Amino acid sequence: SKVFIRSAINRVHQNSAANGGELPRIVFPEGTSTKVLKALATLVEEKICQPILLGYPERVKEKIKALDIPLLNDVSIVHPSSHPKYFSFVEKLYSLEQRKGINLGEAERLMADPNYFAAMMVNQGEADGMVSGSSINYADAVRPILQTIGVYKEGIPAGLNFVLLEDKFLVLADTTVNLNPTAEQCAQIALQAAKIVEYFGIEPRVAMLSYSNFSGAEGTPRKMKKAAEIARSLRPDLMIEGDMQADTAVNPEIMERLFPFSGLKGGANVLVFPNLESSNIAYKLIQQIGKAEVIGPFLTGVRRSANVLQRTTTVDGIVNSVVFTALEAQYIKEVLKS
Template identity: 35%
Template sequence: MKFIDAIKERAKQNKQTIVLPESLERRTLDAACTLLSEELVDVVLVGEREAILKAGEGLDLGKAKIVDPATFEGMDQYVAELVKLREKKGMTPESARKILSTDPLFFGVMMVKQGDADGMVAGAVNSTANVLRPSLQILKTAPGTKLVSSFFVMVVPDCTYGSNGTFIFSDAGLVQNPSAEELASIAGSSAKSFKALVGDEPIVGMLSHSTKGSATHPDVDKVVEATKLAQEQYPEFKIDGEFQLDAAIVPSVGQSKAPGSPVAGNVNVLIFPDLDAGNIGYKLVQRLAKAEAYGPITQGIAKPVNDLSRGCTAEDIVGVAVITAVQAQNMK
């Protein structure tokens, strides 16, 4: 079964409520229609009912729950909670009410915080910064997590590497130039994400332009240190490095370049040394190998909130929504 089909089946088995706050965007409404008609998740749309229905003219949104902040009965409770969370940063009841009334992203995240939704998906018309800001201010990081990072699930057709052609690439969307400590945290979070979403054993490779000391450079030193930290902090996972990409995923090359490594040649979770490498890498595989790319999916937030590419399709939104639902299932 294809990765996304398996995720959809898991989403159906224990339906979660996903808030889609960009509710005047046609792609969002197309996705909502699909999610509802296939009974994948329950959908909450944020905004004024008539405006949303006009934007979704011709779509069956009858099963969607539409919540208008202007008439929402729980607004006083949301305001009080936001003030409590942000009082030290100068948040007043007046400013909290204004932001929750006018910014659907803040309102959507507060729905997740208060348990009125299980996760949120946005970014079709908003920047990553705008999507993640309320998430970090309201939900904060998950217990035991030092860093919020992101990953792509890459499904490569006709590929024998990885987990039958399925990989996690991280971080390919968020952390610009991680330190050794941050790379180790990304490795641990990504291993957990792979296990939760793909279901197979994560085998983590820390990528570099060097394999086991074949080159010397401060950039290599960072990955060597990150590998050591990750192995110490996450002994439950198979983690090794530093590896060039071929040594990480091709068994014969792994055996040649890193003999004795239990990880070399078998990696399914690729940890890139910086955002440039990760972003270039996932786009190369997506375009040249015609891989399906699902993401960027965030990891490390206390409850699941995921950011979309502004170039996303309705189908992309559906994919991220069901992944968010499965993340919510796992967090519970």
Template identity: 40%
Template sequence: MSKSLYVTANESRSGKSAIVLGVMQEIMRKVGRPAFFRPIITVGAHPDGHKDHDIELITKHFRLDMKYEDTYGFTLREARNLINSGRRDLLIDTLLEKMGALEKEYDFVLCEGTDFMGRDPAFEFELNAELAANMGTPLLFVANGKDKTPEEVVASAQSTIETLEEKGVDIIAAIVNRLECDDCFALAKTLQCKTRCEQPLLTFAIPEVKSLGNPTVRDVVNWLGAKVLYGHGQLESLVGEFLIAAMHIGNFLEYLSQGSLVITPGDREDIILSCLASRLSSQYPDISGIVLTGGIEPNANVHRLIEGWTGVPIPILLVKEHTHMTSQKLNDLYGRIEPDDTKKIATALGTFETHVDVMELGERCLERRSSRVTPKMFEYNLIQRASAHPQRIVLPEGDSDRILQAADILIRRNVAEIIIVGEEEKVYTKASQLGLEIGDARIVDPMLYERFDDYSETYFEARQHKGVRIEDARDRMADPTYFATMMVHLGDADGMVSGSITTTAQTIRPAFEFVKTKPGFSIVSSVFFMCLRDRVLVYGDCAVNPNPNAEQLAQIAINSAETARIFGIEPRVAMLSYSTGASGKGEEVEKVIEATRLAKERDPSLLIEGPLQYDAAIDPEVAKTKAPNSDVAGRATVFIFPDLNTGNNTYKAVQRSSGAVAIGPVLQGLNKPVNDLSRGCLVDDIVNTVAITAIQAQAEKGIR
């Protein structure tokens, strides 16, 4: 079951608030404890006295038990500042953490996108798309049909849907709102998603409801902070348009239309009286009221005249600002549903239920879980899974600045219990110079460690058949990498990560010598997690084995499938070759055929196919032609390359040409988790690798 839904528009005044009301009403019918979350709000935070309108509306009407600070992430200004200062990752990470916390505490989280009331709607659209994709939540798109022809509505909405799909967003429904057409339903049905649609797009159309879309005179009073001079009982009149009156009466009257709110300086008694007269005349449309500007009230005689009028026909308001400023303020006013406006709320809910199949939408929202996984989502899930059951991870490179910086982050986020190998004073001094807090890390100096002799003896017993003497064993254990690996081997640590300042050979040689491979496996191999824009693939082996034979290739496939499974990726294994099926021949093709047979023999339940060309493995359309009856072709998640040359070059080509994030190499096949870093790794790479190692350690203990 899905635990969230993201509702967004692509422009202002789409009526999104009314849609959110309707969606939350249906969610309340199906789940016990929902939450409401706006990643980005336009107004400032609560201490200023200004609360977000839609947060107030939803939390108050549905009586949600939530603290205001838990209902939003950042203001739009804060989000823009973070992005402009190069801290986009901090923005996304923080929002993912807040969203994750809500999903843990509540049964369902309804997210609402930005209001598009800023000066850069393109920025807001990109931000909403990125947030929905990274949160992994299905999306409901609200298209604005107000003041558009049917052709314009379809073109704009379809273009937006396709753009959202390109950005990796999982769209489940589109509602075209505020439509003014004869056959709105048929218009909405023309919209569709075009790529990777697991189910047809749900589409609905809702006509324009003036009582929802247009502000009332009361809304004007609240928006402007106006004083009501007359017509206190007529403030619910709907405003159709704002009309500045600056002409002589004869010309001005030509511009009156139904619901006009007339804006004029307070000393224009001629305009005031003509407006009052127009409401009494059947020859003119009914205006909604008058706003007098400049803080100027009518003179005493005009007041007397109005007061003597039996039942003043329209509201008359007074504001301090001049006419131009008043009109500018009113340009930002639109029909809003206030939390205490039971009439509007009932209208919004009734309209929604009349034009939307709430049962179908509710089932789709709750049953659908997005299949899209962005790099940020994958990295966030790594951290969450690792921190759920922290493992003891040893880092032998205590002299590395990046290792210490990563340790600081890992400790702050409770990803793992960190053990750093090095001289205690040197490690703490360097950390202090870097401004880091690593007080909760355990610092271990090999030469001072109480089990140093045990470690040396264990190594001696494991390697004496290779001519190793006890003196040699002690020298080996003085080496931080050998020492850290032995900590893992003997259970004093759950996993090791190294390689930021040492070579791959230095990192994995100790593991080969005494940690050894798992029973039934003869080799250690590796995978990379390739985080594409909307999914994560597993590539193996791209780092360790230069030219595996068929038996080794089968082992790599089985281990890679298990690694995928550990990290929540359903394994569908493609054994890659330059041939699909029987389309090509040769020794290398035969190797892949034999490896596929051996892997199936060892694990009959494994979904595996080979040989497959890469395009047939990943592209559903190509698969229909090259391998039409395959359960793997076109849907592969695990890609096994025939040799290191192919795998290493392919992962780098995909990484550099598509902007994919490559996480790895992740070693597999060992009895205990040991992982290698690139010497060019970033601090974030170290954090991710430690999280991966911790999850592998959890799996070794049966924690999933």
């Protein structure tokens, strides 16, 4: 329920009150987006972020009034190629990609794209985070983030979703990025997801999912089994298990009845998938047919706070997303300070 979301919002507020009442600056490349503007309407009342819109200030304000949203009257609106830092931004993209097939004119056009300008703003500290992708497909939204902000060391870019049940939440990954991760990659995805779960003061219990129950046969079963093993080696305090079926994974009673030798007791709260088909289809089906709220996807593995909305998002979806992006922004900022 929205118990989880309100707890998150309050955690934002304790962080903000803990830092002089400052709010995180969040860039929205899609400054003219109906759904983004409506979500922001809700979001600026509850003091969750300082929003920054990208686009022509004129038609952004004209669509704000068209949409009848008066508390957006004053929000910062930035036109990328008109910004003072534009050309240095361009020189920085060009410098990082001139041996990946990009000439200076192309760097110019790319930096004029709000997605790239946003990613660069976050990289350059002109913002604390960004939220994009309501109007474009995921790959196109995420490419500038990966090229400009990039991943931290031994991290891997991986999408993550929360499934909110009455008792607890489950975490699902990688729901958006990697088609068919290796065992090593699957373990790294488990580690990132585990750390996220720990941030909420929850004990991570991790299952490596398969169509198989503890078979270890060639292909995905041995893949998920060996993923469990690698992960366990990297973090021996954790309950991490696989290969197993999904129902075996979440249902403690089934696990105990059928596989009492298993190291995973009490049901898994972290679900790592073997390929993008299973993760993507699963989160989306649970979101539409199940009676549980699903929030995300959230992009893990990267050096700064940047999340891509799924194109099928709702206005509430965007709201939840901006909330957790704000939390993330605050968290990364503290680490930078230290």
